[PDB]
Amino acid sequence: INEKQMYPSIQAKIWGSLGQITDLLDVVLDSFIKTSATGGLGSIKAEVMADTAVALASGNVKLVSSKVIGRMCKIIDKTCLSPTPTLEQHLMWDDIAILARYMLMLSFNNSLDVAAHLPYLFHVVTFLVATGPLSLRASTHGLVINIIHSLCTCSQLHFSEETKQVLRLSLTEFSLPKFYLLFGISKVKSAAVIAFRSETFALTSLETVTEALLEIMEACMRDIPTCKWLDQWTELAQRFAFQYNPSLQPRALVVFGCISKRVSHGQIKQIIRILSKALESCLKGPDTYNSQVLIEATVIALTKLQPLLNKDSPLHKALFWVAVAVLQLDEVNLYSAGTALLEQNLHTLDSLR
Amino acid sequence: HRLLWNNQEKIGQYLSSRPFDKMATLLAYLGPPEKEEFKALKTLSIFYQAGTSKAGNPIFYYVARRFKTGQINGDLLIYHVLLTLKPYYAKPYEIVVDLTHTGPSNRFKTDFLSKWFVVFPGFAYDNVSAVYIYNCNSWVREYTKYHERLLTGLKGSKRLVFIDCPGKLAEHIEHEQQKLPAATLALEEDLKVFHNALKLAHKDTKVSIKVGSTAVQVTSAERTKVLGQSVFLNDIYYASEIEEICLVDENQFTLTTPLTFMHQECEAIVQSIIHIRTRWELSQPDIRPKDVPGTLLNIALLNLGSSDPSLRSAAYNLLCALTCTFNLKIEGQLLETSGLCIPANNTLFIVSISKTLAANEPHLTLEFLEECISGFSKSSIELKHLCLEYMTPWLSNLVRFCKHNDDAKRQRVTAILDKLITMT
């Protein structure tokens, strides 16, 4: 941190060599994260230590990448012990904010090798979209762009020319002015400029982003036949979907609904009981701002889950009346969700003749 | 489709009434770039009436090497060829075109080509009985193949008659009275004819080479389908523009895309061209697209390390462009994009790319080192540390450019060493 002028040599000599020593990796990274936390997010120590992690990672990509992703996942999961309204208000928010930029910097040049961690990367992206200050939002966007880039430039997985064209198109699409709004970075000319320096979010946006990423993943699995990405990511979502939490669960429900390919009757029942409990807490509790968003999420999940239940499911018809009851609540966002659910239900029953 | 881009700000509004997202997606691969009066007369006399063929029809001569694109308005030229055709456009005639000493500077634009095709009356084209072409070359082939869709109905017709030697054209001219200017007829006398010269390229052809006292000519003994008729190719490459010459091989020689040929008297050919070019050098009155490679590799590599994210991205894309264009064996990992968040500490990446490029492509190593040492003075302290770190991997390759007997190479190596000494 101190010898700024000699930096390009300091890193390449001390850190670039200590990285190639496989056994010391865990201790080095733990000290890195501790020193980053001590400085705090946005600190000179945090920035320097974030940059210095690229140097260590350059040696052993697999181990550093695995340790950096796994600790983020662990912190996110461990957030569900003392739930608080939002993540930005949670106690362990500083840890997530700090460890986020680690993946931001390690994203480039497949220093977060995609072909082993893509499900967890999309997990993080999904849980982080449009969170925190502007810098963190731009960081999440940059992470998405870099991960798609690396997947489009990974030599360890040969892809068809059609798949490569699809990926190139998707990278172009993620740069358009449309996604800047779906990512929370509005009125920012370049994501990069804001990212490398020291608003209400609607779940429809998360649905759009998650669908786009699902297309990006499915085009990839069209080449890697034995891939288990979809199952892994669906499971990691289903862990958070049905588990109570103030901040994570809303996002988790939409992500699960958009992601999953096959549902179960208990899942529909579990979601409906989640909506029931949310509504029951809304009438008694004064924190409507969270129960409402959870109700909307519950509805949005069903609007996607219904087209997948069995042709003999009695719940098809009950879904209509669920939608009617939702529309009876007289909330603009909830009404919109109900109307969407109604359209989906009518279409699904019509297709079933 | 320039207007398709021009009106994308409003086309989406009408489409607001997948298809609905795809209009703006192609903007990634977009951003396209930005009676009559008459005066003057051609002192050059490009198009004129001269000579008559056996069939008793007038023949008009035309030398395309007299006119250069982008200098003289084509309206005047078309009205002029119409004016000189006024007494004869109402009757069937014959045309002969001279394609000697012809290059891309004689290319005819698509708009001017269609203006040529329209202004002449519809019956005058049917009046054309025969078209005679002399000294066809390889540039004309691709010129007309890119303009084939404009001339798709004319290939395969009897009107085109190929002439490679004056005898074939003179057969149908009364007593060989072809009135071509002496400038074109003076290039056939007393050259050297090589019978079995093999033209080495991607597609090997068996041609005949002619090196004279002023220029170098090559004719193709292999029939080439030009406009639907299999004809020979006569390419002329003057020696007044050849400055990349050296002794390379006993049976092969390098000429300038480089030109290579094999023959049993290649040394005599080289000596003849040397003599004529040195005579031309006696007659003198009182950046190239090769040195681009290293001089730009340095500009990309130094700027990657910069401390402005936009500049890093810009330089990365420049690297992708350079590697793709020049086919550098970097493992082809890099792919262009926009908006990449390239990390600040890219010292290891730049250094690894430099090492791989130095090992895989030890080609320039002199332009590159010259540029790096030149830019090492102006860089920052941190940038100086970066610069040395990737400069180091290249100095080893300098051993190669010491053994060669090229005083230009040796003096350059000495200059690089003296610059490094001054830096030390």
Place this chain on the structure above:
Amino acid sequence: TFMEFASVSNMMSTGRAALQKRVMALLRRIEHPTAGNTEAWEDTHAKWEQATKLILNYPKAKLSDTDSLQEWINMTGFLCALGGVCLQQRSNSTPVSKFMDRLLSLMVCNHEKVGLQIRTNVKDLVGLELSPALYPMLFNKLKNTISKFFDSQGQVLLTDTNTQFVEQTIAIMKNLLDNHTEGSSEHLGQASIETMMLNLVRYVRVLGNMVHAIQIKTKLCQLVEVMMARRDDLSFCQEMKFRNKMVEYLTDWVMGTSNQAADDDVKCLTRDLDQASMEAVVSLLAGLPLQPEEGDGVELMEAKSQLFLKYFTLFMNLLNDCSEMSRRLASLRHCTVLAMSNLLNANVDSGLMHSIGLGYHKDLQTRATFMEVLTKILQQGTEFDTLVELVTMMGDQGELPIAMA
């Protein structure tokens, strides 16, 4: 046209000005040469000639005639929108020619009694409302109108009337080009826009440094940009010399008193003029190959290299002090950079030779000002060899919505 002039009446008119404009808009659409058109236009023009004296020599020899001024405003525009039919009929057969001649005489009129209304009305109606068929005559008359200010040697006869004509004519041409009248395309591209533009530039050269001179120069630069925006619309016998010469003429205008300024307002007008000049130059240079005016026996490469170095140094000097009006100091920076990018993209082998040094550094700006081009200047060396595919297949989608759009 008559049938349309029934929907033109059924719809509610929110006053007379809009009804007058709607009437002229329909009159411009009058194309077929019927006989009543002829007599109506001719007799209206006769009454207009009488009212010319009655309104112009009769504030002088004697107000309540503001009503007649308002009538005149309408009647002039009437003649302007219906001028075209008569000229069309001349081609298949000269008062119409005399119409503009009076109009141009009215153009600089100074009257003791509100001539300002007269000038403003002539400007507005002549610019916006004249029929496109009337364009060729307009240009042909303006050419010789401007050609009478320079002497045989090329010495400009600078006069107050002349300058008043020039400010106006440039304003009028700007207003004309700005509006895309229907059919204007096929009528704009017969007369050349070269000579009057050139002469106006030569006259504005000597305008001096007064507030009026700078205000005129800024408007002229806006006109140059607007005219350049439609190199397609106009017809040029020689675009190359055109652009090259006036590029060489506007190069001078930039950085005129950017360091010797003594007043905030004077530098503000100077900064505005420099910004406008740079904007115009950027527009000129797009695709403009350099070909210097015949030199002193210099090989074309040698002259092109010197011209390029001159331009490039002129640009670098401006960009060198562009660091450290705070909005201007950055806007004129990207304008200066885009100008240079325009030079290079056109001029490859007169470029990189003097341009490679721009790749190197700065005060965090020049690399971000040359690689600010290399994004599409030197990485534009892709497939230059000295693309656009599947954009047709997307337009063939069901119901053909894009083509209808």
